[PDB]
Each structure stands twice: as structure tokens, then as C-alpha cells.
Amino acid sequence: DKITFLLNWQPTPYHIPIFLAQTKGYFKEQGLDMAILEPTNPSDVTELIGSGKVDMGLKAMIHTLAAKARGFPVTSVASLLDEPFTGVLYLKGSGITEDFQSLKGKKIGYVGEFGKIKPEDYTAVRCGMNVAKYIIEGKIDAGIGIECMQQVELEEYLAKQGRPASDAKMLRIDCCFCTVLYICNDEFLKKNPEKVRKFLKAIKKATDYVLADPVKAWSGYIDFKPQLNNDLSYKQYQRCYAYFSSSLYNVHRDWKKVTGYGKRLAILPPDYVSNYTNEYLSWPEPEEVSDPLEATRLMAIHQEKCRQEGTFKRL
Amino acid sequence: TDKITFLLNWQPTPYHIPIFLAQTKGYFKEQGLDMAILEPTNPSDVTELIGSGKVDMGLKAMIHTLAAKARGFPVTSVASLLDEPFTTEDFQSLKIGYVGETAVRCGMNVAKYIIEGKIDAGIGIECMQQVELEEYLAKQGRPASDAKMLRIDKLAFCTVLYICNDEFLKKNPEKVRKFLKAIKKATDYVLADPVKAWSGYIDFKPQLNNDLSYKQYQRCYAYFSSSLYNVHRDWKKVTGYGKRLAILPPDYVSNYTNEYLSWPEP
């Protein structure tokens, strides 16, 4: 009766509520036995969870949508990381500029979930979990990544060469495709609704600890995961801080845009039903966000200040 | 679906290199195989996850493999990866850390907590936990010989085996038979060209591109099994010890078999 949970990636600073809920016993007080596993190959995650060989884990929304549309019955039962900035990252002097014209002829990395999606002006490379590595090494010219993960990694390289952190640029998409969701195998959820419900309580307890005291929370996480005891993970942690979902709720507007955007581009069927639910959350849902797009422009500026000032601040 | 799950015994080490290289060089692909390598957060989960069939295969030390069968976890060793690695005063002194299968559980962090003095000593491996201590000593000025180990050489485990869920083996003996090949090919490459092996490995697993890992690799080299064969002597001994110590039943059978290797035994 162990429950398996497959992370979306190798351990990250934003994986912190999951591990913390384990090391502080929160799963235990719920009568839950979590076996948290890590993937060697992030592309395995949806097929694994979908087929049922793994009960639960983490996955981005773009990929969670595609899974259902690929025959892998999975469902989102909570939100871990809400709308982190996604895009084509590059170094100043690449030579890519603020214009997309400069991306022509260049070589661009991505994780490799997709495959074939002006087909031969760019050159796609499949880098898996090493997109930012390969940019730094020049193997690729640019690559897809996240503002609080892959961009921070570019800036850590720049800092070692004495270069300002702003030399790490992003061609920004524009949402969001890259929200990290807690997911379940549909079958497991149907037969274990109480367990999933108890799982999310422990998650919520540890998220609260994380958001109330990011520092004390981190010290314990890195005592348990020394591979993250470094300056790069601590900066990434600082930039994830604002992206963490405090309520864990699926945001209906976000789901509605992406799915509707998908239907308008003929990618998803026009009767596709979005594969989330907020029903296993055991506490009240927060009000909708009033100015949804202007809070997007505020976030960029806020993340801009985090990069320079080195702190923990929610938007 | 038809993915086969292989759950490592630990976070990625330098000794896991054949498994990873067999993937990155297309050896599993050329055998018609789809491997999904998983890595545990908690080593203690491994036996039970393979034991219950939730995961198909993986790695486990011998001692723990034997205990698994004796815990109602139907697992069987189909090959060997690392044969017999070497496992306040220099006498008895009663603190002490153990992985999880005075008494303090440290999981995969034992050596770390020794360095940090949260524990006095710990149970670990000459090529892994020990080389770690010796790295610490080198940074603060001491000789590598300042990291000392007891328990090495006595009358009385930590050989690491490729292992299968019994039901998975029964219903997929050819798949297992093709996996061990890929391993073999990769392994031969590692043994033949340990440096060039190592480079592609760290290109793929950056978390090992460091002086500690490369020193472990060097110590790990000697314990690699070239044949992948189960060594009957070792299994007989260890199951012998258990019986004569009344831990295992006197009609307990070693849960290994070399029948899925497809090349001559040394």
C-alpha cells in the first residue's frame, strides 16, 4: 500500500513542499506512505502515470493536456507552480537579439516532450534536462526554459565570468503552458479519493510553512538534499518563491485559455474537456483575479527586482 | 503500455554508468527495448516497490535482496553489477547511523552527517561513503588516510545486483534476456575505455561532473563485474551465515539465477 509519486524532473527548489511534507511527517500523520521517485527522462512521466504504473506526480499543464489527448487518462488535482515565465533563453553576444529574425539559422534546444510541431529555418535540438547547460556550452544557440530555473542557471554562468545577470535574455512566449500541477492517474483517483485528499492536506501544510518561512524551510530541505546546497539552487528558490501557488487551486481561467487556444488552433478536438478538478482540496477557494493580464506585466517587473535584490517576496 | 521500469538503488552514482550508457548509446533501442530509469528518493522504498510488482526491475545489494525474499517480497537476482565492495577507537565503542533497512537513520546522507558530526561513525562503502570523507579531509588539509573504516575484514553483503520482480521475470524472460545484453555491451565499453566512458556519462548527468564523483569512479572500477554473473560462492556464504545465525530458515533458497545471461560463465 505505498503510493508512488513521480517528480517532473530531477529534484528542484520548487519541489520543496513535497519533500518537506515527507521529512516533517505530514504524510505520516495522514496515514500515508509516499514513495517519491525521480525520472531520468522527463518524457517518461506522462506515460508512466497515465498507464497506471505510477499513481501520482508532477507535470506541466501543456503536457498534462497533451496526455489526455494522447490516450493517457491523467487528472490535475492541484497546482504547484503558477504561470512561471516561459521562453527562448539566450546569452547576449550569441548572437541573437531582441528580434525573432535573428533566430533564423540558429540552433534551438528544448526538452523533447514533443517532436515535430517555416519548418527548416531553425534547427531543433533535443536536450532533455540539459537545455541551459548546452546554451552555456554553446552547443546550442538558444533554448526553451523557465525564468526561475533555466534563466537563473544562465545567470550563474554569467556571474562567474563577471557578466551582469541581465546578459541572460529571454524571448518571451507572449497563459500558462508551464504551470506545474500535481497529477493523478484517473483510476487511482477514483479508487483512492480519500488518499489523494489526505495527500493534498499535507502538501498544503508544507506549502504554508514554505511561504511563511522560506529560509527555515530551505535549511531543512538542503539538509535532506545536499545536491541543492549551492548558490544556484538558492537563487532559483528565490525566484520560484512568487510562482508558488498558496491555495493549490487549479485556476479556471488559465485552463480555459490554453484549452480554448488549443481548440482555436485545431490541435485539440472542439469537445475536449479540461482534465482538472478542485474537488480534493479541503479548504475554501480564493476569489478570481480581477486584472489578469496586468498582473502579468507586474510580475515581470517583480521578478526583475528579485534578480537584482536577492529576496523572498510574493506578488 | 510497454515501458519497462528500472528503479535504481540510490541517487545516481558513478557505478550506475553501464545502465545509463546503455540508454544514451542506443543499446536498449537496438534490442527493441523501452527502458524508463527511475531513481529513488528513499532507498528503503526499492525492495518493496520491485517486490510488489509496481516497478519491474532495479538494483539492490545482496543482503537486502535476501531479506526481501524473507519478507514476502518475491525478487530474484538476474545479474551482478558490483561485486563485493568493501563494507572512537579501533575496537568496540558504544551515535551510529544506518540507511534505513544511538541508532540514527540517515538515509543516503550517512557520510554527510559524519563530516558534520551529527553522527560519530556510519555504515558505508569504501568506494562511495569513504571517498566522500577523504574529500572533506583534503579540503581542510588532512591525509586521505584520516577517514578510517572498521567492519572491513572479518568472518562476516553489499554486492549490488540487477534484480527482477518474480512475476515480471516469468512473463518477460526474453525482455530480461535482451536487457542484460545491452548492459553487457555497455559494461564492456566502460571496462575497455573508462575515461571516454566517463565523459559521455557526465555530459548526460552533470550532477556527477565533479572531483568527488570521478574519485569514486576510480575506486568503483575494480569492483565492477565484467561477466555480470552471480558468484555462487558469495551467495552460498551469505545465505549460509543467515541460516547458521537462525535469521533465515534452514530451507531458504538463494533467490538468484544466471540463466538469463547469454554468454559463457568464467
Residue-range domain boundaries for chain B: 1-84+157-266, 85-156
| Best mutation target, B9, B13, B38, B52, to test chain A (most A CBs within 10 A) | B38
CA–CA dist B55, B77 (Å, integer):
15
A47 touches chain B (CB under 8 A): yes
Resolution in A: 2.6
Q: Is B122 annotated as a binding residue?
A: no
Residue where the block lists cell 505505498: A2
CA–CA dist B240, A281 (Å, integer):
53
B24 touches chain A (CB under 8 A): no
Strand order in the sheet with B75-82: A74-81, A180-185, A56-60, A3-6, A34-39, B35-40, B4-7, B57-61, B160-165, B75-82
A308 touches chain B (CB under 8 A): no
CA–CA dist B261, B228 (Å, integer):
8
Yes or no: say if A186 and A49 are a contact pair by the CB < 8 Å rule. no
* Set of cell numbers at residue B80: 551482478
The region that residue A165 occupies, defined by phi over 0 for left and psi between -120 and 50 for alpha, beta otherwise, is alpha
Residue where the block lists cell 525564468: A147
Candidates A62, A111, A92; CA nearest to A275 is: A62
Pairing of strands B35-40, B4-7: parallel
Interface of A with B in 221-280 (CB under 8 A): 224, 226-227
Yes or no: say if A201 and A120 are a contact pair by the CB < 8 Å rule. no
Say whether domain B85-156 belongs to CATH 3.40.190.10: yes
Q: Is B51 annotated as a binding residue?
A: no
* Set of cell numbers at residue B191: 571496462
Yes or no: say if A45 and A16 are a contact pair by the CB < 8 Å rule. no
DSSP one-letter string for chain B: ---EEEE-SSS--GGGHHHHHHHHTTHHHHTT--EEEEEESSTTHHHHHHHTTSS-EEEEEHHHHHHHHTTT--EEEEEEEE-------SS----EEE----EEE-GGGHHHHHHTTSSSEE---TTTHHHHHHHHHHHTT--GGGS--SSSSS-----EEEEEEHHHHHT-HHHHHHHHHHHHHHHHHHHH-HHHHHHHHHHH-GGG-SHHHHHHHHHHGGGB-SS----HHHHHHHHHHHHHTTSS-TTPPP-B--TT--S---
A65 in helix, strand or coil? helix
CA–CA dist B215, A113 (Å, integer):
35
**Cβ contact (<8 Å) for B39 and A38?**
yes
Q: Is A287 annotated as a binding residue?
A: no
Contacts of B41 in chain A (CB under 8 A): 19, 22, 35-38
Yes or no: say if B77 and B65 are a contact pair by the CB < 8 Å rule. yes
Contacts of A35 in chain B (CB under 8 A): 40-42, 45, 49
Which CATH number is B1-84+157-266 given?
3.40.190.10
Give the residues after which the backbone of chain B is interrupted, taking a C-to-next-N distance over 2.5 angstroms as a break: 87, 94, 101, 156
Contacts of B232 (CB under 8 A, 6+ apart): none
Minimal Cβ distance to A40: which of B39, B49, B206: B39
> What residues of B act catalytically?
64
Axis-axis angle for helices A252-264, A61-68 (nearest 10): 60
CA–CA dist A37, A57 (Å, integer):
9
* Set of cell numbers at residue B71: 519478507
Interface of A with B in 103-142 (CB under 8 A): 130, 133
| Best mutation target, A6, A12, A20, A40, to test chain B (most B CBs within 10 A) | A40
Residue where the block lists cell 550532477: B207
Q: To the nearest 5 percent, what fractions of chain A are helix, strand and coil?
A: 45, 15, 40
Which CATH number is A1-83+177-315 given?
3.40.190.10
Contacts of A4 in chain B (CB under 8 A): 49, 54
Of the options 3.40.190.10, 3.40.50.300, 3.90.1150.60, 3.50.50.60, the CATH number for the domain spanning A84-176: 3.40.190.10
DSSP A113: S
Greatest pairwise CA separation for chain A in angstroms: 56
Give the closest-approach CA distance of A128 to chain B in angstroms: 9
Task: Please tell me if the domain spanning B1-84+157-266 has the same topology as the one spanning B85-156.
Answer: yes
End-to-end Cα distance, chain B? 37
